[PDB]
Design a protein around this nucleic acid. Structure first.
Ligand SMILES: Nc1ncnc2c1ncn2[C@H]1C[C@H](O)[C@@H](COP(=O)(O)NP(=O)(O)OP(=O)(O)O)O1
Ligand SMILES: [Mg+2]
Ligand code: NA
Ligand code: NA
Length: 326
DNA sequence: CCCACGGCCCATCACC
DNA sequence: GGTGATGGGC
DNA sequence: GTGGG
């Protein structure tokens, strides 16, 4: 229930963002986010810092902040950083795709604090940053599953049309049956591309998707990883659909399913499955599953033809994508 | 007291 | 021109 | 900031 401890998880999430974007302290960012997660999943309305401290990832200092929040309805440090022009400006600008904590600080140092200021100083943005600025509003919109369905239809049709031997899967929140998504994650393979192996295989797919005006902009494109922008087509009368983020990854056929597993199931689910695989003497990464020897020495990758094979290896009961939140 | 904390591709920067 | 470091994303 | 060596 959101109404349960939302004040607290809103407080921690805001603190997480200031640590990441202003303080450049990624492990404090993660610490606040962990604390917010476990608190959000906690079945009761917290009454004290001490009650919260029992939970793993809640320490003395978050416990102290919860006491102040519950006693006053506020956190002084947060009220202050909220009113601070430089800090609130830095935090805001990192919302632009391609502006991280370092670019944000440099921009605010030379008086560039707003979107308007960025529009007026485009010569000082790289390519990625210009696209992020151009689509600022569209990038913070979520993608209803209906639209994701329409998007999958276009990606699977165009892929098959370039070469019928391509395998494409839409992974991420979408493949877990989420009713909305932040972006589209596409994994691509082809029988000609294995571990013991052309860079045109990715290029060709991106090109076809640009030819039918589904992909509108490129943030980054290599031999194996594409990041860009797409848009569903509209019906003249009907209003333009928002621009959406799409990632396409080319993966060797023999690492494909390790990829599908990784880029599909929740990060939490990936961490838990990884943790359990260690218990059973296997190291799993995004690429491969390897058996650990007696001394912890990683053996050669095991053959994987399906997701289920990975589950089998670590003697786990196969979990459909929809049941991979944790 | 001290260290770890998911890790890798791609763009661009610093430097040679 | 090139390599390696850094920032950024996810 | 939290956990744990
Ligand atoms: N450090 C990491 N970087 C990227 N992916 C990671 C990861 N750790 C775990 N993963 C896994 C878990 C992720 O599922 C997957 C990539 O998906 P996203 O697009 O990053 N997020 P999702 O699609 O779940 O949700 P939505 O976009 O709707 O917010 O990679
Ligand atoms: Mg996603
Ligand atoms: Na604790
Ligand atoms: Na950003």
């Amino acid at each position: 229930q959101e109404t349960l401890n939302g004040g607290i998880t809103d407080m921690l999430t805001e603190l997480a963002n200031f640590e990441k974007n202003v303080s450049q302290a990624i492990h404090k960012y993660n610490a606040y986010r962990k604390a917010a997660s476990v608190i959000a999943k906690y079945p009761h309305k917290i009454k004290s810092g001490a009650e919260a401290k029992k939970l793993p990832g809640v320490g003395t200092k978050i416990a102290e902040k919860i006491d102040e929040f519950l006693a006053t309805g506020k956190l002084r440090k947060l009220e202050k950083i909220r009113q601070d022009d430089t800090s609130s400006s830095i935090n805001f600008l990192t919302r632009v795709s391609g502006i991280g904590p370092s670019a944000a600080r440099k921009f605010v140092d030379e008086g560039i604090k707003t979107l308007e200021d960025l529009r007026k100083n485009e010569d000082k943005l790289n390519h990625h940053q210009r696209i992020g600025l151009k689509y600022f509003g569209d990038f913070e919109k979520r993608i209803p599953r209906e639209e994701m369905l329409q998007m999958q239809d276009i990606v699977l049709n165009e892929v098959k049309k370039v070469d019928s031997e391509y395998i494409a899967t839409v992974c991420g929140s979408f493949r877990r049956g989420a009713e909305s998504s932040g972006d589209m994650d596409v994994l691509l393979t082809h029988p000609s591309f294995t571990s013991e192996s052309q860079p045109k295989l990715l290029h060709q797919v991106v090109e076809q998707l640009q030819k039918v005006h589904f992909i509108t902009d490129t943030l980054s494109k290599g031999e194996t990883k594409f990041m860009g922008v797409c848009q569903l087509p509209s019906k003249n009368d009907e209003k333009e659909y928002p621009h959406r983020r799409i990632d396409i990854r080319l993966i060797p056929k023999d690492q494909y399913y390790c990829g599908v597993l990784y880029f599909t199931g929740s990060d939490i689910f990936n961490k838990n499955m990884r943790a359990h695989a260690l218990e059973k003497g296997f190291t799993i990464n995004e690429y491969t599953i390897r058996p650990l020897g007696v001394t912890g020495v990683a053996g050669e990758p095991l053959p994987v033809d399906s997701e289920k094979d990975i589950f089998d290896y670590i003697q786990w009961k196969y979990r459909e994508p929809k049941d991979r939140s944790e």
